[PDB]
Amino acid sequence: PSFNTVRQGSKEPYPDFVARLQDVAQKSIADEKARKVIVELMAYENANPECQSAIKPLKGKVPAGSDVISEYVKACDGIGGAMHKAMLMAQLE
Amino acid sequence: PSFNTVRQGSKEPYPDFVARLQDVAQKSIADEKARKVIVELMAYENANPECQSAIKPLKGKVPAGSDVISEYVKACDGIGGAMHKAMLMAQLE
């Protein structure tokens, strides 16, 4: 398929959802930039509807010099149990 | 936000959904490749759940030398009225 079409399933571990996002983006991409930009992007666009919803505030915002994935996984760092379903109505909105 | 976070709304015209997808990807990206790859990718990942669903068969497959968007818009070229809602159960699945 695409590289990055790999996406967070039922509360799939986020740093892992994106780690394979990057992995195969890396397998299919020779451009680190296109690799990152799509891992860091699909991290939202491809993530769980709640998890990208954890991400939308960070969406576009990355710390200067840091990885956006780090933050996007940090976004869903609260998603995976209980808080996932509390935030489901807030973030997924 | 991102560049490409612009996505097909309620049966939003697809070549147009992605044309702005590309536009702002172009505004925010200096790399034509990262521009294309994300327009051609978000063309699915960001498209309408039916329209990307029009795209999944083309997802990853582009004609040698052609734009994938051309095909992805062609995918939703049947989406926008009537067939959209027929295909809604098939493609969105």
From TrEMBL, chains A, B:
The chain holds residues 198 to 288 of 426 of the full protein. The gene is gag. It comes from the Viruses. This is Gag protein.
